[PDB]
From a paper:
To further prove the critical role of the RLGSDH motif in [name]-Api selectivity, we conducted site-directed mutagenesis of [name]. It shares 19.8% amino acid sequence identity with GuApiGT. We solved the complex crystal structure of [name]/[name] at 1.9 Å resolution, and the RMSD compared with GuApiGT is 2.64 Å. The RLGSDH motif in GuApiGT is mapped to FFGDQ of [name]. Based on structural analysis, we inserted a serine residue into the motif and constructed the 375S/Q377H mutant of [name], as well as the F372R/Q376H and F372R/375S/Q377H mutants. All the three mutants could catalyze kaempferol into its 3-O-apioside, according to the characteristic [Y0-H]- ion at m/z 284 in LC/MS analysis.
In plant biosynthesis, the formation of glycosidic bond is usually catalyzed by uridine diphosphate-dependent glycosyltransferases (UGTs). In this work, we report an efficient phenolic apiosyltransferase GuApiGT from G. uralensis, and dissect mechanisms for its sugar donor selectivity towards [name]-Api through crystal structure analysis, theoretical calculations, and mutagenesis. GuApiGT could efficiently and regio-selectively catalyze 2″-O-apiosylation of flavonoid glycosides, and showed strict sugar donor selectivity towards [name]-Api. This selectivity was highly related with the unique 45-amino acid PSPG box and the key RLGSDH sugar binding motif. Through theoretical calculations and rational design, we altered the sugar donor selectivity of GuApiGT and [name].
Numbering used by the authors: 4 to 157, 169 to 249, 253 to 453
C-alpha cells in the first residue's frame, strides 16, 4: 500500500452505514490505498446484521471504545450511550489510530470523519493531514445548522435569510439549533461542528446538487470543497430475498398499487396511532407491505391481522431499496430519514411523511413544499381520516399526477448526477484527487 487513510464513524443511528459505503467506493477506486475504518463494536455488528459490511483487501475495521463500562451489560438509553461515547472521545480514536499506524507500518495521510466528529480538525492538524468531513443527511439539514447563529439572533425573517429554505417553518428546524442553554452532549458536538466545518479540506454528502441548487451554491461559498457524490445506491450484485417481500410484490398484478410502510428499524408511533393507521389501511383496501417489529405487530387490533391476511403483508425487516425499486410499489409511508427519502427518489416512489425527530421534520417540509414528491399528514399523525386522505391523494388523484411527475423528474435528476459528466460523477473524481 502507498497510502493509509483513517475514517472515523459516528457509531449511532444510520451514520456509520453511509460513511462505510463511501469508503467502499473510495477503496474500489484506489486499490493501492489502505482504509482503516474506526467504529464501535456495537455499530460494526449492526452493519454486518444489516449486511452493509463486505470483505475488501484494502479496508481494515477497528473497534473504538464506545465509553460504556466493559464486562457489564449496558441497560441504558440511546441518550446515555451517546453521552458516554462523546465523553470517551477523542482519546478513544487517538489510541486506535496509533495502533493502526504501527500494525500497518504506515502513518495516516488523510483523515475522513463523520461531520459530527468536529475534533477531526484537531486530529488531522496534529498529524499534518487533510480533514475531510462526511455529512450523513441532505444539504437542507446542513444549511439549517450552518445558519444556527443567524436563526438564534431572531418565521418570514428566517425564510428571508437562508437561501433555499424559504418554505421551512421554525417548528421544522432540527431543534438541537435551540438547545442553546444547558446543551446535551449531542447539541454541544453539532455546535462545535458548525464552527470547525469551514476549516475542513472538503465537506462530502450522499446527496446530488440538483435536489437543491440554491442551497448547494450557498454551501459551496461556505466550504473549501462542498462535494455531493450521491446517491451511493445509484453509483454490487444483490443477494436473494429470504423475507418473501419480493415474491409477495411479484404476485401484485397492477403497477404502483402497493403501499410500502416503514418507520425504520427502531421507532414506532404510539399504539393508538398504529391502530389508526391499521384502520386507514382497511378503509382504503390498497395492498400494503409493512416493515414493523414483532412487539409492535402484537399491539395492532387482533381483528386487523385476521381481516388483512389477503390484503397486506407485515414483516419485521424488508430489503427496503429492492422493495422501493419494485414496479408494484405506488407510495412509501416514511419517517423521512434522509436514506429512506433518497432511496424513494432513486426508485421514483412518492412519499407520505410521518416525521419523528432531528432532520426528519425539515425533510418532510422539503418533500411537500420544495421538491413536491409527497404529502404531510393533516395534524402530523397517522389519524384514520388523515391517512385515508393522504393515501387517496398520492395513489389516485389529480394532485397525485402532479406528485408523480415531480418524483419522476427528481428520479431523472438523480440518475443524470451519477452518470458520466454528472455533478456527482464529477464531484467523486474531485474527491479522489484529494484522497490520492
Ligand atoms: O425494514 C427495513 C427498514 C429500514 N431499512 C433501511 O434502514 C435505513 C434507515 O435510514 P434513514 O436515514 O431513513 O432513517 P434514520 O436512520 O435517519 O432514522 C434505510 O437505508 C433503509 O433502507 C431496511 O433496509 N429495512
Amino acid at each position: 500500500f502507498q497510502s493509509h487513510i483513517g475514517v472515523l464513524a459516528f457509531p449511532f443511528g444510520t451514520h456509520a452505514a453511509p460513511l462505510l459505503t463511501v469508503v467502499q467506493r473510495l477503496a474500489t477506486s484506489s486499490p493501492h490505498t489502505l482504509f482503516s475504518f474506526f467504529n464501535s463494536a456495537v455499530s460494526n455488528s449492526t452493519l454486518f446484521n444489516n449486511g452493509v459490511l463486505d470483505s475488501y483487501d484494502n479496508i481494515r475495521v477497528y473497534h473504538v471504545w464506545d465509553g460504556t463500562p466493559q464486562g457489564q451489560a449496558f441497560t441504558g438509553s440511546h441518550f446515555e450511550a451517546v453521552g458516554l461515547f462523546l465523553k470517551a472521545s477523542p482519546g478513544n480514536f487517538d489510541k486506535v489510530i496509533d495502533e493502526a499506524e504501527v500494525e500497518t507500518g504506515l502513518k495516516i495521510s488523510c483523515l475522513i470523519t463523520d461531520a459530527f466528529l468536529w475534533f477531526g480538525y484537531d486530529l488531522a492538524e496534529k498529524r499534518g493531514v487533510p480533514w475531510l468531513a462526511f455529512w450523513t443527511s441532505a444539504q437542507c439539514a446542513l444549511s439549517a445548522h450552518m445558519y444556527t447563529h443567524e436563526i438564534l439572533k431572531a418565521e418570514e425573517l428566517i425564510q428571508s435569510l437562508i437561501p433555499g429554505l424559504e418554505m421551512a417553518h421554525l417548528s421544522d428546524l432540527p431543534p438541537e439549533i435551540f438547545f442553546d442553554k444547558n446543551p446535551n452532549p449531542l447539541a454541544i458536538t453539532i455546535n462545535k461542528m458548525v464552527l470547525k466545518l469551514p476549516k475542513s479540506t472538503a465537506v462530502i454528502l450522499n446527496s446530488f446538487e440538483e435536489i437543491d441548487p440554491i442551497i448547494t451554491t450557498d454551501l459551496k461559498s461556505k466550504f473549501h470543497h462542498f462535494l455531493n457524490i450521491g446517491p451511493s445506491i445509484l453509483s454490487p450484485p444483490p443477494p436473494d430475498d429470504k423475507t418473501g417481500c419480493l415474491a409477495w410484490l411479484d404476485s401484485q398484478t397492477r403497477p404502483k398499487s402497493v403501499v410500502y410502510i416503514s418507520f425504520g428499524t427502531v421507532i414506532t408511533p404510539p399504539e393508538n396511532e398504529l391502530a389508526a393507521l391499521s384502520e386507514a389501511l382497511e378503509t382504503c383496501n390498497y395492498p400494503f407491505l409493512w416493515s414493523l417489529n414483532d412487539r409492535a405487530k402484537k399491539s395492532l387490533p387482533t381483528g386487523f391481522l385476521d381481516r388483512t391476511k389477503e390484503l397486506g403483508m407485515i414483516v419485521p425487516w424488508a430489503p427496503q431499496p429492492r422493495v422501493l425499486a419494485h414496479r408494484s410499489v405506488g407510495v412509501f409511508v416514511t419517517h423521512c430519514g434522509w436514506n429512506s427519502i433518497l432511496e424513494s427518489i432513486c426508485s421514483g416512489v412518492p412519499l407520505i411523511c410521518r416525521p419523528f425527530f432531528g432532520d426528519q421534520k425539515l425533510n418532510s417540509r422539503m418533500v411537500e413544499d420544495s421538491w413536491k414528491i409527497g404529502v404531510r399528514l393533516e395534524g402530523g399523525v397517522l389519524s384514520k381520516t388523515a391517512t385515508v386522505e393522504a393515501l387517496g391523494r398520492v395513489m389516485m388523484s389529480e394532485e397525485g399526477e402532479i406528485i408523480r411527475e415531480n418524483v419522476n423528474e427528481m428520479n431523472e435528476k438523480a440518475k443524470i448526477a451519477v452518470e458520466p459528466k454528472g455533478s456527482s460523477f464529477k464531484n467523486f473524481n474531485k474527491l479522489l484527487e484529494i484522497i490520492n
